[PDB]
């Protein structure tokens, strides 16, 4: 990339490689401090040994004015850390829809290449509905299914994000797409989440779908449980 790097010295660990005063200012939302460092000739595209830029940190803190000044001075929008995080992913972590919108305005890719850090999944799993909204407005696939993770719907259910599950279903998410053959309905009955089971069913979940073990959702609940009596009622 076109930018300054901070290298680790594995033989000299006190030597700084994991931070700088630019990162320091970004993480704490000190945009005036960032201004001063920039006017002193410090690059905004400066990455730690783990490939973290000040923009990554500003986004993680929801520091909108810091994001703006970094972007103004050429901060890379789509940089990926050693953990595959993009600035957009980090904004989704923080829940700052303002930061998310601004990044998307600056052409941030809605769906980065590493399915190891999906913004829409992260937003959904955290219940950040506004962030989910912004991603969809910029082309994000509400049903994007990742191997060994699932859909945003599946993750929202798994993390008990009832308001988010409701919003995803209201926005047209496929009620029946989960993770592999484990539909969202299977997953929530297994955890005995009656709120989520009824919500999913209200939006047309398939009570007859079979999972990897060949089992319908009803077969994952105790026969005397209130869920079982609901499933039986419908059959």
Tokens 């994991």, located at residue: 18
Structural domain boundaries enclosing 45: 1-235
Can you tell me the distance from the alpha carbon of 194 to that of 217, in angstroms, rounded to the nearest whole number? 12
- The values of phi and psi at residue 151, to 5°, are -90, 165
Number of domains in the chain: 1
Helix axis angle, 129-137 relative to 119-126, nearest 10°? Answer: 150
Count the neighbouring beta carbons within 10 Å of the beta carbon of residue 143. Answer: 14
- The values of phi and psi at residue 159, to 5°, are -100, 15
Q: CATH number, domain at 219?
A: 1.25.40.20
**Residue in 114, 117, 102 with CA at minimum distance from that of residue 70:** 102
Beta-bridge mates of residue 146: 150
Helix axis angle, 31-39 relative to 64-72, nearest 10°? Answer: 20
Contact between 71 and 55 under an 8 Å Cβ cutoff? The reply is yes
Can you tell me the distance from the alpha carbon of 23 to that of 16, in angstroms, rounded to the nearest whole number? 12
CA 20 to chain centre: 26
Cα 179–Cα 145–Cα 100 angle in degrees, nearest 5: 125
Q: Write out 167-213 in H/E/C secondary structure.
A: HHHHCCCCCCCCECCECHHHHHHHCCCHHHHHHHHHCCCCCCCCCCC
Can you tell me the distance from the alpha carbon of 132 to that of 172, in angstroms, rounded to the nearest whole number? 13
Count the neighbouring beta carbons within 10 Å of the beta carbon of residue 145. Answer: 18
Can you tell me the distance from the alpha carbon of 179 to that of 187, in angstroms, rounded to the nearest whole number? 9
Contact between 133 and 98 under an 8 Å Cβ cutoff? The reply is no
**Residue in 213, 111, 120 with CA at minimum distance from that of residue 167:** 120
- Here the tokens at position 200 are 């999913």
Contacts of 157 (CB under 8 A, 6+ apart): 165, 184, 187, 188, 193, 196, 200
Q: In angstroms, what is the resolution?
A: 2.2
**Inter-CA distances, 47 with 13, 53, 212, Å:** 17, 5, 44
- Here the tokens at position 3 are 């930018």
CA 81 to chain centre: 15
Count the neighbouring beta carbons within 10 Å of the beta carbon of residue 42. Answer: 17
**Residue in 163, 224, 225, 150 with CA at minimum distance from that of residue 194:** 225
Q: Mind giving me the DSSP string for the chain?
A: --SEE----TT-SSS--S--HHHHHHHTT-HHHHHHHHHTT--S-EE-TT---HHHHHHHTT-HHHHHHHHHTT--SS---TT---HHHHHHHHT-HHHHHHHHHTT--SS-S-TTS-HHHHHHHHT-HHHHHHHHHTT--TT--BTTTB-HHHHHHHTT-HHHHHHHHHTT--TT--BTTB-HHHHHHHTT-HHHHHHHHHTT--TT---TTS--GGGGS-TTSHHHHHHHHH-
Count the neighbouring beta carbons within 10 Å of the beta carbon of residue 147. Answer: 8
**Residue in 56, 62, 60, 72 with CA at minimum distance from that of residue 22:** 56
Can you tell me the distance from the alpha carbon of 23 to that of 51, in angstroms, rounded to the nearest whole number? 12
Beta-bridge mates of residue 5: 47
CA 163 to chain centre: 16
């Amino acid at each position: 990339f076109p930018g300054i790097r901070l290298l680790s010295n594995p033989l000299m660990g006190d030597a700084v490689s994991d931070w700088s005063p630019m990162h320091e200012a970004a993480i704490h939302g000190h945009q005036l401090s960032l201004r001063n460092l920039i006017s002193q000739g410090w690059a905004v595209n400066i990455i730690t040994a783990d490939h973290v830029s000040p923009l990554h940190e500003a986004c993680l803190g929801g520091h909108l004015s810091c994001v703006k000044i970094l972007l103004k001075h050429g901060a890379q929008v789509n940089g990926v850390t050693a953990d595959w995080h993009t600035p957009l992913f980090n904004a989704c972590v923080s829940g700052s829809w303002d930061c998310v919108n601004l990044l998307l305005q600056h052409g941030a890719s809605v769906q980065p290449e590493s399915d190891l850090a999906s913004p829409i999944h992260e937003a959904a799993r955290r219940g950040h509905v506004e962030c989910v909204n912004s991603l969809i407005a910029y082309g994000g696939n509400i049903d994007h299914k990742i191997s060994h993770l699932g859909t945003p719907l599946y993750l929202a259910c798994e993390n008990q994000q009832r308001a988010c599950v409701k919003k995803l279903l209201e926005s047209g998410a496929d009620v029946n797409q989960g993770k592999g053959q484990d539909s969202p309905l299977h997953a929530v009955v297994r955890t005995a989440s009656e709120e989520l089971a009824c919500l999913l069913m209200d939006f047309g979940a398939d009570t007859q779908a079979k999972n990897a073990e060949g089992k319908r959702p009803v077969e994952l609940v105790p026969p005397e449980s209130p869920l079982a009596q609901l499933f039986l009622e419908r059959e």
